[PDB]
């Protein structure tokens, strides 16, 4: 088990994908949902960005 000091998500932050299709990708945190604990994060493709919505500890910090 490791602890880590913060445990909060943000808006602007980077993080990798750990759950859905884009699994082992990177992505951006778009908008968060603290109040449903659930994070969203926008994923950059090839002229095909889509967001994509996801829950907390489904993204990992970089």
């Not at 998500?9 to 750990?18: A, H, I, N, P």
């Not at 908008?31 to 996801?54: D, H, Y």
Request: proline share 6%; net charge negative; aromatic share 6%.
């Amino acid at each position: 088990g490791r602890p880590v000091v913060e445990v909060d998500y943000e808006v602007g932050e980077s993080v990798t994908v750990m759950d859905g299709p884009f699994a082992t990708l990177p992505a951006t945190i778009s908008e968060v949902n603290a109040e449903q604990q659930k994070l969203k994060v926008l994923v950059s493709i090839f002229g095909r960005e889509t967001p994509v919505e996801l829950t907390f500890g489904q993204v990992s910090k970089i």
